[PDB]
Each structure stands twice: as structure tokens, then as C-alpha cells.
């Protein structure tokens, strides 16, 4: 009980949730984004990332930087669709 208080970063909120979905503070800067916005973002990100990955699957000695960058949208789309769910079930 004599342990020193644990320092945490500024503006650290309570994100623990036993509800159906988290509190939308889990999404940080994107907490106010709409569920429809997240859905469209996830679909667009998935399509663009899949296309840019296919444009690089037989990787050459000189891959395109824009295709490399856009390939990172496929992992991004997962987070986006998870957020869409969270924001749909948080009321938005």
C-alpha cells in the first residue's frame, strides 16, 4: 500500500468497459468520427490496399513508393471496420 502513485500521461481517461462496446474514447482522435465515415473509410482502405499489394506481390528491385504506402491500408482497414462497429454500437 506504500507504493508511490503511478504516473500516467496527460489526459488519461478510464477506458475500461463491460458494456456491449467500448466508450468511443478508445478511438482517440477519431472518437467523433461517424460510423458511416468509418465504414466508407474501411471499404476504401481495403480496396486500395489490396490493389496496391497486388501491384507489388512480385516485388521488383524498384518498387513504387506510393504502392508501398497504400499497401498499408489493408491493415488499416481492419482497425477502421472495428471502429465502425464500436461507433455503431456506441450510438453513432
Amino acid at each position: 500500500a506504500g507504493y508511490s502513485p503511478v504516473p500516467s500521461p496527460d489526459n488519461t481517461k478510464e477506458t475500461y468497459w463491460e458494456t456491449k462496446a467500448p466508450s468511443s474514447q478508445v478511438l482517440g482522435i477519431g472518437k467523433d468520427v461517424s460510423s458511416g465515415n468509418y465504414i466508407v473509410a474501411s471499404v476504401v482502405a481495403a480496396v486500395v490496399g489490396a490493389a496496391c499489394t497486388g501491384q507489388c506481390i512480385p516485388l521488383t528491385v524498384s518498387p513504387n513508393p506510393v504502392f508501398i504506402l497504400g499497401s498499408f491500408l489493408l491493415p488499416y482497414s481492419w482497425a477502421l471496420h472495428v471502429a465502425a462497429w464500436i461507433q455503431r454500437n456506441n450510438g453513432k
Binding site: I29, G30, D32, V33, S34, N37
Partner: protein
């Protein structure tokens, strides 16, 4: 609502307070992040792009003595590439980086609420002392900067397509 896009709801973040606010955010990019940060970025882009457009025209019209020898027939990004080797772009980068470190301090102040976005207290000639004149000037600055972003995009991409600077292109087409 959304006067700009009449079939969409007014953006939640945009309440119409800021200059040049016509409720334009169809994709809802103001919801993500802080609107003060986005306004600082927008004004930075506005000023930089209108300087860039005026510079494109002025480089097309006039060139400083002895620059023709260094750059040959290069225009626009060709001039950029030619003078990176020379070192002019390096010096510009050094000095702009100095100014941008201080602008980083300014942005940190803005996010804390101390500084209005895009306000660096730069008013040597004293224009805008009168509040109404300052408001008019702010709206004109935002509108001209947006027009200039679009104009510089058009100029650079017209150079890409044709290889001709803005006014040299306009002369012949």
C-alpha cells in the same frame, strides 16, 4: 444544412465562427483531430501556395541575372532539381527550417489556446489595425490562398503535361 453542400448536414465541428466557413466538410475530416490544428495547416498551405503561384508566374516572366546560365531551359520542378545541386534549395531549406522550428513553438502555443491559428503578429505596414478591415482581410486571405492552392496545382500539373510554365503555356497553347 451545410450551406455549401445543401444535401448534407452541417459539419459538427464547424459552427460557422471561423472566417471562410461555409460548412464544407463532406468527408467529415474536421471530426478527426483538432480544428485549430487544421486551420493552422490550412493557413500555412494557403500562404505557401499563393507565394508559390506568384513565384511561378514571376519566374516565367523574369529571372535574376545569371540564373539562366545555371538552370538552362529548366522550368518549375526542373528548376528545383537544377538548383538542389547548386545549393540554393539547401539554403532555402535551412532558413525555412529555422522559421518552422519557431512556428512549431507557435503551434504548440495554439493547441494550448494561447495563440489564434495562423497568427504570427506579422503586420509591419500596419494593415488591419481597424477590426473590420482585419476581418475583411482575413476572409480575402483565406479565399485567395485556397484559389492559389488550386492554381499552383494546375500550374505544376500543366507543366507536367506540357513542360511549359504557366504564362508561357497561356501565351501559345
Amino acid at each position: 444544412m451545410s450551406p455549401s453542400v445543401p444535401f448534407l448536414k452541417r459539419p459538427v465541428a464547424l459552427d460557422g465562427s471561423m472566417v471562410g466557413d461555409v460548412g464544407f466538410d463532406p468527408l467529415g475530416l474536421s471530426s478527426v483531430g483538432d480544428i485549430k490544428f487544421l486551420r493552422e495547416a490550412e493557413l500555412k498551405h494557403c500562404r505557401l501556395a499563393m507565394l508559390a503561384a506568384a513565384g511561378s508566374m514571376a519566374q516565367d516572366l523574369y529571372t535574376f541575372p545569371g540564373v539562366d546560365k545555371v538552370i538552362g531551359d529548366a522550368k518549375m520542378t526542373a528548376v528545383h532539381d537544377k538548383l538542389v545541386s547548386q545549393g540554393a534549395m539547401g539554403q532555402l531549406l535551412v532558413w525555412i527550417g529555422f522559421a518552422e522550428v519557431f512556428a512549431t513553438m507557435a503551434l504548440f502555443e495554439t493547441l494550448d489556446g494561447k495563440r489564434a491559428p495562423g497568427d504570427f503578429k506579422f503586420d509591419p505596414l500596419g494593415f488591419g489595425k481597424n477590426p473590420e478591415a482585419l476581418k475583411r482581410y482575413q476572409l480575402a486571405e483565406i479565399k485567395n490562398g485556397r484559389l492559389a492552392m488550386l492554381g499552383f496545382g494546375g500550374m505544376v500539373h500543366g507543366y507536367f503535361v506540357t513542360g511549359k510554365g504557366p504564362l508561357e503555356l497561356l501565351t501559345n497553347f
